[PDB]
Ligand binder design. Structure first.
Ligand SMILES: NC1=Nc2cc(OCCCN3Cc4ccccc4C3)c(OCC3CC3)cc2C12CCCC2
Ligand SMILES: [Cl-]
Length: 193
């Protein structure tokens, strides 16, 4: 519907100030069509919002385009992804390339051990720049999930084709997309229905 569109909207939490956001709608989630995945300009995580019911969203507008519209071997690979720090020095995070992003062609879904939520980057550009090291190599979708150890509910929204024990989860209480490999320790408190 609004998938593939660029959007703008206000955001307000509680009595806080309204901030303005511009982004690109990537996906309307099949198991919950209220849920949209959005890439905001300049922000590297993928966000999920239930736009038709989230009272924090105001003044939702579709923007006009005004401009008219293979490294798939990276998919599934463990990588080391370098980036810049305040001090001028580079650091790196290690992670896994999950998939090509929808809608924004040249972009890839990736997640990281240090922050296992969904990110989206132009990985082939970063590779050409020397900032992406590829390491040598080497349904539950729609179910409810709960985390208790802390009692958090959500839904399994995607399975990663390249690594089928890996799933994307949307928790009811947050707008990040959480990524889990269900055989690992990070997933050991997740239970499904
Ligand atoms: N072409 C790029 N490749 C990047 C790779 C990055 O990091 C790859 C690992 C993930 N980040 C590590 C990190 C550390 C602290 C907080 C959040 C994160 C997320 C990246 O990180 C953001 C900067 C602040 C560090 C930014 C870029 C750009 C996007 C546009 C500017 C350059
Ligand atoms: Cl651990």
């Amino acid at each position: 519907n609004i998938v593939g569109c660029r959007i703008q909207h206000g955001w307000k939490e509680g009595n806080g100030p309204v901030t303005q956001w511009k982004g690109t709608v990537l996906d309307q989630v099949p198991v919950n069509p209220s849920l949209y995945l959005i890439k905001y300009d300049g922000f590297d995580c993928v966000y999920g919002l239930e736009l038709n019911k989230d009272e924090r969203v105001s003044a939702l507008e579709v923007l006009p385009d005004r401009v008219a519209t293979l490294a798939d071997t990276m998919i599934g690979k463990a990588v080391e992804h370098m980036f810049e720090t305040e001090d001028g020095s580079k650091d790196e995070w290690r992670g896994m390339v999950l998939a090509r992003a929808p809608v924004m062609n040249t972009w890839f879904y990736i997640t990281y051990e240090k922050d296992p939520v969904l990110y989206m980057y132009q990985l082939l550009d970063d590779y050409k720049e020397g900032d992406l090291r590829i390491m040598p190599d080497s349904s539950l979708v729609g179910k409810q999930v709960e985390y208790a150890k802390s009692k958090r509910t959500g839904m399994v929204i995607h399975q990663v084709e390249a690594k089928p024990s890996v799933y994307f989860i949307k928790f009811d209480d947050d707008f990040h997309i959480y990524v889990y490999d269900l055989v690992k320790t990070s997933a050991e408190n997740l239970y499904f229905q």
